[model samples]
Target: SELNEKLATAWEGFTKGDWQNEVNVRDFIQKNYTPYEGDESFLAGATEATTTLWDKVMEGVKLENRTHAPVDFDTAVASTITSHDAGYINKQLEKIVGLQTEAPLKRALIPFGGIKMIEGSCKAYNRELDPMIKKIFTEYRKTHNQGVFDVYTPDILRCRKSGVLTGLPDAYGRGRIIGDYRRVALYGIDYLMKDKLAQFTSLQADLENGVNLEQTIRLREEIAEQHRALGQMKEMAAKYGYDISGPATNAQEAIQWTYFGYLAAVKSQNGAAMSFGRTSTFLDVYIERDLKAGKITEQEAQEMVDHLVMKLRMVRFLRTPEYDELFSGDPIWATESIGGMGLDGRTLVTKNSFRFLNTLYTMGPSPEPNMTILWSEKLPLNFKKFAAKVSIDTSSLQYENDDLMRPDFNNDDYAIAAAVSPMIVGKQMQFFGARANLAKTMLYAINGGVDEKLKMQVGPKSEPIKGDVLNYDEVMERMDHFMDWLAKQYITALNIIHYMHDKYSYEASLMALHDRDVIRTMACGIAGLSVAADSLSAIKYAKVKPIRDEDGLAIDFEIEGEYPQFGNNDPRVDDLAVDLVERFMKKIQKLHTYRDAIPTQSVLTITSNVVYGKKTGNTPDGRRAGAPFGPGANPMHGRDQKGAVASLTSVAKLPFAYAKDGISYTFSIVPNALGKDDEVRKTNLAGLMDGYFHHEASIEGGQHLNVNVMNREMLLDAMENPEKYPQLTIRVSGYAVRFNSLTKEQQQDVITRTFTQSM
Candidate 1:
């Protein structure tokens, strides 16, 4: 009662004071940082840990030396020659601040420059790491398992010859290769530590069930690995002066434990965009409890969230200059899903959700923790208004339709949602990654399986079409056959690669956090959907005549008349988009998979569209060879003449179940278009989403939308004179990047995208 009284007093004062002064708030917290009677020991341990562990980690991090390079085409290439340490992973664990036998049972989010770094400061660590990436391909080439690699490798080769981009580009691969697209259910951790005795009992029971010797040994190893990791967290906390081995009893504890889980993965050098799965909802339980108890004011709660976000914003990874070049823009898709309608039909839009959104306003904008709202027209007007406010203010928010995705992931048995990297947590785990080149596949039909650019007889040598004029029936028939072959080859390659990746570069840290017996998914993807759909539409509606080079390969295409395009809400082309997704999904699912994994696909193109375009030749949609495909599931630039709502309607038409991984649509809009008055803009933006998502009550029209609310003039100026706007940020495809941090190609792509002026 006395502790509650103290907290209430502090809360009342905090509410009346300057909440924006982060320093004053921090000082207040420090002054009154005493734990409640029930939390006395734990708070002491945590308080000590945050200070001690922080300083020790900072000893080597040297944040002062870190400097970000200006975003440019030359930066990635130039930085390759710069000398720096591979990374701090090796140094981190060894340099534990003050080790003890047991760590404190408390939680605190600490800053560790050990992760997240500027390109100027760090290089890729351990070149000798995972040699098997190359070794497996060698063995694959030598193996004689015709049942698998043989049938597909030829099709892959043929696609390469015919200018189709498949999974294995050299062998015919396309799209951004997605990795580590999974989220650790932090709530599971809360449950586990909630009752340590029960956790161990469950583990022991599992260990006993390993009937076979090898099976038993693997379980034992997995258990030991988990134990080691848990102990390390405790010990690391103790060195900093806290205990985190026990269950969290407060909001701070909850945040700290969650942060530890993410930090552990980073320490392991797992380079995927690690998402914080549905965190706002998860953390809401703690925050609401604290609020009810009068232990925190709204201002204090907002402060905690902002500080937590600040830490997320600071997470950096060490990548090779070349890797950095390809994946430029310090993109750490620490995706968090917010504001969805639950399976019970109740809105999941909690106060904490709004508080999390409030961080964008308070802490300023950043691309990390890619803030995503699971939108449904059924969501409360206030919640929708808040989301719009954040979008306009920061241009850092992306939204996914809950109405569409919930059913797709949940079906009837379980309720689920995707973290922005789009990993839906259920009974299943996944060999997750992005798509095949849909744009280039159309060329195979025109040229009869010969690559226009490579001049090699790559795909199966189906005979070239009779003349310059393309027959829709003939082209689609050939396309169907090629798709069948491509699907087999694509799945086969994914199976082999995942088989090897797990064998060598396994994610033990993350997997340990999940259920040991989770089902697995072979998450596949597709690139260039708009290009393929529109090109096919041209063939069906207009005269699409191919101009072949000397080798009979269609080097370029000529379209005679206006044809319907995808993104215009025109059924003619929208149906083609639907057909393309469903057809590819059907074929991909039919093949045998590694681990008998459930086959799923995504229509997501990150920054890899540039690379995909560089290698791909001309397409029948009148796209010139070497031009960029639309980013993610967005339509070709200038193709969607209709307003944003119409484009969204067309995109929503693609069946969500088919692209289970994700169908990411990046929508860029100018600030002035949202509205003149800030409040009016917020309301108008909310209305736009409400109307767009209106028809889909429990149904869905579109899957995802990432908004970029910058004007063309600002972006153009930033590109030419980067120095003027050092902190300018923009959403490019699936992630956020500093305007000055982007490659020239990426910069141009951002400029070329049609910006929305009105809803």
Candidate 2:
């Protein structure tokens, strides 16, 4: 009782404390950091022993308990290098730069892929441990059911679900995606043309306001030259089916061209969308056509992918040092994805997608780049055969799907969300956030955790050049850009963190009732008191030492012209991005020796418990009075637009894998209660998948999602008539706890979520 009392007091202090102080974050990190550390050698060895032991225990099992085996050093080296050729490595690299990173290179490069091989290997190792499941499946002929398991990745659950359905387990699991063309297109356009247009606009304004007729005439001459330049740019844009350039004194035409390019890209992608639902696609048409038409060198295609993954706007960064520690000097492992059914009944297969798979085949078994093929019933035969072939190589590929094998938990709303989100969104948003956050360490362990230098460390220097379009300089340059942006961004992120610190409430009343008072009492109370004691800590701190004149500080967090804070799409974010990447690269290049070192980060996308403290926190983004913080990756606690696309647009701008470490982001979407209608279900499922595929697929390294699939009616019924479904469960973290167990506000958030059944 005394300990409980102390904990309760601390909990109260924590919730109510002034969060602007560093003590809260520091204390939390220090307290919880222990759960994330271990003897890597022991873990590696134990896992290996489990594999051997499990092999012996299940020698005669008829079922396919497919999990991946640890790769040999040679295979690991090959897999690492070859993966670079595919879009996967590039994507991971891009994530390091704070841009979005979703390169399905492993599976695509390998010609076939899925998550089953690894899951199967893990299951194979845990044979002695999971005898109950084995007994249920092998002897009783009853498929093992995962009543609820939220802590695990959707892919793992997907594997189990599929295994339950198919007598022979589908080793690879299914992945979900959500894509919003409207938003991503908006961001992409801004990325390519916003700055350039601003330059032109400014130049034109200066010409218009000339001091004299002679100056005006000169300006006209310059304008004519500009017209020629614009014409050349327009011609190039037309040829490539893009309008990257802004209006050439002909604003309407420019706008038309821009939309035209965006539409063409979207439609082209839509045409091939359904084909990805299956396992493999044909490359003979797209690859050969582009190749023959001299549109892109196989190498150029590879390079484009590398760039795609490293953009900073597509990733999230918590702090500069932390971000650098994970990705600095690490060779990015891009993991691209392709899957799901099309709009029409027929599969949407394409040639370029196939060649992407072909490149996977050629790359074979290394950390270069990786690909994951999402499988559904509608996939083409060629893709399947390729998947089977690569399954044997243990190369850069994995397959997965829950279209057939979703577990039978009374509360499987989020699991269903996990399964179905990717079809609508793009792959990037699906994996990094909505999906469970797995560690870079795990990726290394799967490959025996050994690099080409025979060291158990990761770095970009070790990547192989597989003739992808990526130029080493370009990839490195992008990384440099993000690091600088993060340096600036961190100052702002920290401000929010500090603001959260300033407004903490430390309420232990909620936690005390549950008998889990460890954090409730002393920590919260003391912490709150500590912060309450000081209010001046709310000012932003410079991440890097600023440039200064004599007796003055030449600080650089300006909103215009070469310096700006991150999070508002400031151009300075780009300039600052350069310096930070340089620093991050320097850190990575200075490799340290450690066995089984893995990069990981903890991201609470919806951490509103104590940080935002309801009505107390004062943040720089103008958040005040009772606002929420960390509300499912929405901008500064749901202070942004309501449309899912707008949220994704902001999320995509975060520095994803750019830091080359683990980061996770999550969003809570309300579900359309179209239960049991096959057509509606299929269409909704398809839309959800499509949306994530196009947007912020990855946000948290772990614990990134808490999707609630309830309709307004269901919520109302639950509220007004509480006794009807006492046993109903909703996904909490990694498990489904009783709906009644959640706090009222948590339930309310679940109720208020926007149900975006279709993208």
Candidate 3:
């Protein structure tokens, strides 16, 4: 009775729902949270401690960027939940206290990415892996990277080596899972420990014969490992002097408890795009409950979230030169999803929603905790203005269409993992595959399946197209055959990669937080979508003469006429763009996937498009060799004749049903283009989002857009004066990074873009 009384006290001042019966947080939130309809007036400023921690952290960030980060690597230990002892940054002043290592800015050793990546990245940054730690994994523990190479077929190897495909999760399980870290705060470790055991017990007793053998065997051990990890999380909490064995008693505890769950994941696993799931609303209800009880103040609440954001900002993982080029900008992709409507008509915009974004202003804008707003026109007007204002001020925000995903995505609490890989928070996960180079595929088709850059046959030998002028019908027929062959090879390689991931370096702890029978998606991706589509459009609408060398490989193209290009809102090319995504989705699905994961694809490359472009030859669209392709599903640079809305509309034409993983579109408009004043810019920006999202939601439109309202000259000034704009963050595509962090060529590429200048 005393124990039950204690638990009831924590649950007091809140409405109860199925959350009391099972782990249905969506139902609990719908029953409890207060939706703030007012503007940002209720928000509080940062406290002394908040400013103290932030300034100290930025110094570390600047120092790392200057010196090459991993401020210091732990040469002693391999990462796990309890590897570090009571980590803190100014422990006395810190409201939420914990770190990946025992000290702030010190990188911990993560071995899950296999031995070679660990060794190469360590040496690349002038460090060495501990010999003993290296010995364990190489001789005894075979890594996911090793297992993949053991099974990679020559076809997969050829494309991978030649950069035909890139960023495969060979070394790491690239950011596909979002651990329901919020669960630890709400239900804590001990109770969920019981649920995992219950599921494990249920699995053991099942008598499904052959189906139960390896399946049951795998999960039984996984659940046990999950149980151990959960207990260590509890102990890790103990080291920090807290009991996360029960619900958080106050708002501060709620934030700390939630952070502790995520803290453990970063310490143990280093998934490239690991995200902090839909958290603001969940934490807000706890704050409101505490406010009603007179236990906390609004000032303390704001500082708590700011402190949590500080922790996300400090997250570091070692990366190789090759890996760094593919992702760029030292991005951890610690994506934090904020703001969406509930299943009912209630708005999920709480005071914490404002507070979470308010931290951008509080600490100054940063690129960590990749802030994603779940947008809907049904949301409160004032909150929309606040969101738009902040975005215009600092280009550190991304938007996902809540209205489009809500109806079809089923779970109202779904969050976008990393760059637009949305899944219902705790019940779903993804298998992230790297993007295939479609422009290169088109060129390969023209050259009898020989790689243009490599000067060797990477794909199956087919007759090279013959003619001074390309025939549209013949080109389409030949390219269609190559795409099918590429599709089969793509999935086959993904099957090997995923099989190896599950066998070695399985995400046991992250999956522990999910529903036992979680839904899994095999998310395939494509680079050069715009390049391929526009190339096809060029062949059809204009004269494209292949410049074949002596080996009969088409190394370049001579365009004799202008074709209707994408981004012009011209249906001539927009339909071709739409047709490409839909067709490719169908092609990949035809092949069998590993573990029966339902097939899905993304038109997202994050920032690897530049690297892919370097390896690609000149295309029929008249794009020069070694130049950047338009980021994500965007059209080639400076080609949009119809202005901003039409450019967005053309991208909106892409079918979401086909690109279920995501279709990311980056829109950067100079502030002067929107209007002369700040208030006008915010309204216009909000209206632009409303129309972009409102576009045929009944059918399909833009699934995601990262908005950056800044001037072209300011970007140039930042490049010229890199030290002055220390945190000059900008949206490259689905992700944002500091301007100076980009290479000289990449910086010039951003300046070269034809922005939405006269909206």
Candidate 4:
């Protein structure tokens, strides 16, 4: 009867697709979407209530910044979909409501990720972890970390400890899996659970299946958890006087139900990169439908968008020292992917796109809900300029190449999660293996698999170079042997990590929103690309003599004459950067991935540059011990002398096909460098981004760039007087962070980092 009523009401006057028969949101979008071809003139301003509520939220942000500790914690209970009563900040003024814990910015205690992490977080904040909670995970149940240690080979352990591979998600939630939040709004909880039940029965449809039979038995149990979690989502929404058991009938209900889905995932686990999927364009359909019927005004629409952003800005996770240093500035990477062109060749740009970005203007900038634009030359020009203007005003936006990714992915509904990974919502997931330091890996190759500083055997034993001046061809041969071993070691480590992660800290609710069968990826990454490339370049173009220690370990190097370094767009050295990534990827492609997931890698190391640098030794490129590497695929500081365009050209040469995960680059430019005039800066910045991502020579160039428009002096002042600039947001290698949020060394790293001079 309810389904019949919905066809007569909410489901009426819409194009039907396979989504109506099976759960396919992409089909529903492809069939019914109104492209907004107009400019921002039709956009509305924020309501008085929206402005007032944001002020209250801003004050809360400042207090949290001042204290540098969570306002409160729910130590007694672990966070779940139904863990706490529905909480709000000023219920009378808010249109959207729900928080992870009982209060805003109150860090949740999610021990399922890792007991040790939770315990360490409490110690850092000067609060004691609840003894019963510790007992439950440590003695009674095995955490994800504990299970990985039990299965790790001796080689994997040494690699992790030796900094060859760092930032593995063995101890935390490996969260790049985005739940299709729009599906919950469109289909409701009951219909979705029934669909999941149907898939579960079919997966175990084979006969002779018992408790220990096949992977289906395990999936059947996991689906049971998924259904149970879906029920809890409904129960959780009911506590706030809302029933999500039925499809949303209006624009307001659509936003509320969509947020309810995302709220459940955050409440369940503390993932490293809990990304918000591609949703603004999907929500636009409901808003436009309501606007035409005179059901809601422009003011009401902005109210919902504003409050949803406010709640997302307040997402919090307790941090351990090791975890904090690895990814600084309290990042959950709650990345919200915005504007991109659709597969049908219509621009996905909508009025809601402007409204979502308008939150930066309505409420000043802060760094959660990472704003990412999927850019292509095919997008409308006005929206392109608008996006560039926002980047100039607030340095909180990142751009990814949409044209390059869309054809291969073949899905318009994909979202870029964890800052750099592209995955179809609910259809794809990743096994996030942090990165192997190629700078350190190169050192191991030269030193015969022994660590120069630790004086320990870290890599497989090979003959060290027995010469004073390094021969380029000989070193290249050594790299082939060592890179092969490193790839094998990296893939084996991830296999152990994901097996334990799946068995121990399984994602029940997040996976429930996905199809029964989905494509999985083993996402590997590399750090110190420039360092390794330049070191090899120095050997080729200039004279380099290795200074060896007593054990014949190459401790340092002496260089003579000038070599064309990376970032100058010189093919001599740039081609080496290209060769390095392509060779390493070939090795990874040959290996076996767990779950039969496809192999992919990323050229990214967010805040881990300093952490990785501390463990590495000197390089033939003339880098000293304990010096920070360049962020992401960026060239070394002061090394990119030719200016902005040429620098990115060098990085752009690294083929995206080889590193399908993503390539990350962060560029900082002084305000006056673009132009002395404000409007001149905005349009020039837009053109700059357009030119950077434009396709060239039959290949998609420039995969990603995190643009930071603020000057170096602003960061300096903020570092000295942090209270003066509460919302001083700047883009890191992969995400945006408040200046005050970075550790002191990280702040210095930004200042000493290169700047674009408008070339």
Candidate 5:
């Protein structure tokens, strides 16, 4: 039902194809962007009142193309990205840009080059056409209209006249309705390549100046292509009947149009372009057949495929350490998840889903954009194995559950939309270093460092030492200690490609945009630190503790390394785990009070579990090497052999209700050898769900879990005979997807990993 409604609404919007409405919608969203005041003080408000470091980590110097300098207040009316002077040039092209349309210029928008034939166009439905669509388009295209493209040049001129610019953040917000909607990337492509070109040009000059150089060669390749591409696209303005002189006036409209175009092409003729969202095998062939029949152009088919591929596509290594130092790398990662059940329980998987993954696997990861799969329990069988195989190289595939999220509790429509943010935010936990409840941290920190539980010290009780009297070097030194610790810790290294994030981060473009204006606002958001801290420090007053024996000698804390680790069945691990998380969470909260956008939470399942077992040898609780860590917030890996129930029980220890917008817990479960009919299977799932709900409390998050039902013999046999278990599916993050859709490595990860079995 939810899916149906979404489609219906989408159809309505597409059918109207009112460019003016699109502009208005975009203007509305632009209006919501935080204003830029001349004062630096404005930055403090967002951190303290609105978002946290986790929510704000993408802040950095805005690259040139990402955001232009704010023009003089005297000449320009406003500084908003939505300001007419800023985006007016490109706005006029709305008709002929034919965004999300099967129109000529619209289809050539892809990188591979060429135009997509219009087999179908954005649905006009039964509504009367907007007379202005053709009128404005014809007016703009008549001559080499300098007036048309000239209208937007003033915004750039105004900024130059003002002669004030900090820099632009790199955020390409959602711009595609169905295509890769990553705006940060869409615009960032210009930022990075252009910057690289400048750097290379400077290097070439220096090399040529050197006396010892026989011949200096300059490689102005990457950015050169971008410049050339833009130039070429601009040259065809008359033929294409569009303009490209300015930024998009409205963000959502741009995104919707991109989506609109892709959908139109594919729907018209089952074209070759792979759909990025829910798709199926049956549709894939139909699309291909259409393409073969010449119903679609070669360019159109390729563009479709590219769009789907790029949506969930990953850019593994966008930059290196030097690049990070120069640009402070972007942190907003892009990943599109497809294939799951609709709100009414109908399968959402379609032909485009498979093709998208197919291309991502073939491509690889980049430091900027990363591809990830969001698998659920309801995914088709073939999709599961396909995802599994793709998972071998791609690192972003996560699992979710429709049964856990949909129509059961929330309104079906609300659930479909609400579920998306949580699942995404939950994955953040696994991507980052350590885990903690950001919501609880904020609740406590905001009230001055007292946690919600037991009134413990969740974070630092005081503000970071201000370096107003000191120089910038001293100021950096003060924060560098924490940064150094983060860099050295096993958490970031194992869980993330830690070294690459300094320059490129998620929401980099937004940060750049904010920077150009007067307000120096940039920060992360964390509201859950104080509660975690309170939970830990509050225990000091308790007369009874879990680790205490009859003697009450405090043996574990006194005898152990003064701290606990997860996965060891040790009660001390639980205590310290809560404590460390609480402290770290508080730190994030404190940072959020400053206007610096940063990625504060990450989901770190695969690598952390791998390293936690190998990095630390046996501890006081007796965990062996190469064992599993405490399920989520508990002890060592493989330490709980009792069964999957123990692991689930341990996971319940996490304060799930307090992790407002961070990451979810990584859970692993083994299916009973007795199979689906066994009562234990249902009970385990039910019990796990109960625990998840208990921990979830009032927070806006859930958990990321994976399940394996087969034993080694069965797993091995299945490997040899893939058809034997046609209906088999595995739980990845929040949903159940077919196991076959995953990559071999991913399948083995679930298959070979230790699970609770018979003694």
Candidate 6:
């Protein structure tokens, strides 16, 4: 009877040819079916829910490109508004309820269907929604932008305008936001549902406790929406004959639950990077339990991991051809942080962790989920050796210094540092996202507040430093003032951007899985540390005279002193890196933030370094104008002559506690450099990491390493003949990208990195 009922409903829609008319079919389903009642047949209930969900998602469809499949945002928004009839939260819940789980894969419990948008096209959607985006921008700019910018000392603005004090685009957009994966991975959907329901009750009571009527209503609605999305997920699972509202009992189910939670967020809204937060260890629990129980074999376990990765690879959205070109290879930064020391003081490495890494060997390397390793001396030697083996085999794994970062992210020593949890081992969290440009601050200091490349006064103009012989004290003094302004505007921009990001491109599904009262972070970053640090080193050590152009801007520098470059284990330059961290941390703390967002900073520059270089003029450090800054926290290419260990040691000196969010390093090593023999190479590479984390020399090693083990010849060969190595994957910045898919500039930058053959 249940089957018949479903078939009959399908027959009715078919008979009327409603399928041919999208709206007509949607309306037909709306009119015909109702939400599942307790006793309805599972198949029938699933059919009803599926149809209703699809109908709502379809409502948001706006086909901008005729040649490619269209993705809808307005329809999704409308569906959320209508389905729940509540404020922000409730609307999102309704939208999640609408995504159908039609294509259930036989290999796994997770279903794959999600809203249509282009892959890695958050920017694409932003462009498509420009009219609306521009409108929001105008309002936020008028209301928040000037107030934030005006606080900057005039000198700071001059620095900004001079292209030296580049603040990235914080004056316009919000800071980056990263999801806390533990929300889904650690706690199953069932527990999250229960917690949200409890929160909703608490929120309702707040209504009686004199909470602002508007705010209370909005909060209550948001909670209800999260609750609804969880319920919808349960319904989806039930459709596949599984009860997902409880803890998963096995690795397969765990992956399913985690993927489902992640997928919900992806479907709900477009974000720049949907990080698969440090998942290997979390998933290991399930895998280990199942392995001991003899319920699954290692091969099967490997298969499950592969299957999960395959789904991750297929995560797609519709984007314009142009967006595709900008972020080629459809890269989804599903960054998975692996191998770290647990807060419990035990090595977090697990069998499943190895299985996840084994995918490189089994699945034959492809870059989709950015696999990251948390490197620390305390970690099990076996795991470190395993990671190195994978790195050598595939050149795909990324390693971050857990020892340097853990104390800062988890440090209770300093109250302010302890509060932020966006970048931590486990449990603590924040909306981890983008970085600010720190490299251009020197330019701002030298030329007053003016952008050299744009030829526009961006920073507040002040008296340019008198004479070409740079005054370290004056430059530093002006810079100190500029940093104050930079920090304030950065925070203000994050607040506005996140507020609008939620308002316009709200991540309902993902946020639903997160705690209703999430630990928010204003994750800030600096792009050109090497450039800025080196410039200051030039100024402090070298007799850097200004080579001015007609515009009265110092376009290049005439160096006279012997200056030590950054990325080498030289205190002359390394101290500048340390100073940069301390200065930024101190300045950032002085500002007020939105949503009580705890402030954190990272030293990183992905491929954007190239774009940044093009915009910036030659620096005092003798860097040619328009040369890309060192990617991540790496030293300038050809400057770190001391080798990889010394390079990492110099980076290690940067105060990790100050850069609580992240301090990224893009490390490249030739395999032959590690050791002459294969086993020797792996052992030495492992030892290198172990020494960095444990040895006195690197007591405070830098956090995050995006490593590539290819020689220059290999990369050059790939560039010349793309078809030969289509599967080659290389680390770009925080994420790994396919070699062939990279733009010519990015590819060249990769090739240009310091290829150290001796460790």
Q: Give lDDT per model, in order.
A: 0.58, 0.27, 0.84, 0.84, 0.30, 0.59
Candidate 3, residues 1-759: lDDT per residue as tens digits? Answer: 223565677777667677876777778778888888899998899999999998888787887766645577776588888878887779889988888888888877777668888788788778767899899888888888899999999888898887787778897656678989988877778778988888888886653555668778887888888888888888888998888998887788889988888887887787878799899999999899877777788888888899999898888877777777788787877887888887787788999999999988889989888999999889999989999999998999999898889878766799889888899988999988868888888888888888888888898987899988898889888888888988998899899988888888777668878888888888888888889888999999998998988877788899887899899888988888888788789999888888889989899876668888988988888899998888888887888867789898898888888999999888889888889999999999999889888845365667999898988888878877877988778888788887877767777777877688876
| Tens digits of per-residue lDDT for model 4, 1-759 | 234576447776678777677788888777777777677776677888888877777777777667666677867687778989877777898898888877767888887767888877788778887899999989988888888888888888888888888788876788877888888888889889998888877866462545446676777888888888899889989988999988888888889998999899999977888888888888888888888889899988888888888888988887777887788777878887787888889988788888888888878787878989999888888898888888888998999988878777887888998888999887888888878888888888888999888888989887888888998998888887899999999999899888888888788878889988778889888899999999999999999999987778899899998898989999999999999999899999999988887889899998778888888888999888888888888898778888778887888888898999899998887788778887788778777777788875586788898988877777778888988998889888899888877778878878888888756
- Once superposed on the true structure, which residue ranges of model 5 sit more than 4 Å away at CA? 1-13, 17-334, 339-397, 401-580, 592-595, 603-618, 624-635, 656-701, 713-753
Give lDDT tens digits, candidate 1, residues 1-759.
222342343243232233122112112222322222121111111222233433443332222112333111111211110111122212232222221111111111111111112222233331222233234333542321222243455555554334354333111111112211122112223233332333345555546675565544555565555545555545444444555544445666666566656555544433345565566665666666687789876666665566566556555544335444445576667677776776656666666777677656554566776778878777777777767877887888888767666665552112222223344442345565546777766676677776667766666778987787988999988988888877876787777666545433344445555445556678776878898998899999999888877767778788899999888889999998989999999998888987677888888777657666766888878877788888888899778878777887887787776877778788877777777888888887777666655544454566677777777887777767865664466677777776766667777877887776655
Q: Counting only residues 3 or more apart in sequence or on different chains, how many pairs clash (N, Cα, C under 3 Å) in candidate 4?
A: 0
Top-scoring candidate (TM-score)? 3
341-436: candidate 5 lDDT, tens digit per residue: 545444555544554554433333222122333334444545555554333223234444443444333322111111122321101111222222
Candidate 2 residue spans exceeding 4 A from truth: 1-596, 605-616, 625-627, 640-642, 649-656, 659-665, 668-678, 694-707, 716-721, 731-737, 748-759
Per-candidate TM equals 0.76, 0.26, 0.98, 0.97, 0.37, 0.76
How does candidate 1 score on lDDT?
0.58
lDDT of 6 by residue, 383-453 (tens): 77778888888888877766655554463111111111234322234443455566666677677867667
Per-prediction RMSD in angstroms? 10.5, 29.8, 1.5, 1.8, 21.9, 12.9
The positional error of residue 283 in candidate 1, measured at the CA in angstroms, is 2.1
Where is model 3 more than 4 Å wrong at Cα? Answer: 1-3, 207-210, 695-699
**Residue 593, candidate 3: alpha-carbon lDDT:** 87
